[PDB]
Amino acid sequence: TXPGVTXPGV
DNA sequence: GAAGCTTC
DNA sequence: GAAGCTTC
């Protein structure tokens, strides 16, 4: 996740 | 180095 | 299955 807590997704 | 998960 | 970048 993220930034923060990629995406999802990318 | 490891917890921080949906989108096509 | 790839499709990903980080806060702590």
Structure tokens at A2: 């993220």
Tell me which protein residue sits closest to nucleotide C6, measuring alpha carbon to C1'.
A3
Cα gap A7→A5, rounded to integer Å: 9
Using the CB atom, is residue A10 less than 7 Å from strand B?
Answer: no
Which nucleotides in chain C lie less than 7 Å from some protein C-beta? 2-7
Q: What are phi and psi of A4, to 5 degrees?
A: -125, -175
Q: Resolution in angstroms, to 1 decimal, for this deposition? A: 3.0
How many angstroms is C1' of C5 away from CA of A10? 9
Do A8 and A1 touch, CB atoms closer than 8 A? yes
Solved how? Answer: X-ray
Do A7 and A1 touch, CB atoms closer than 8 A? yes
Q: What is the 3-state secondary structure (H, E, C) of A1-10?
A: CECCCCECCC
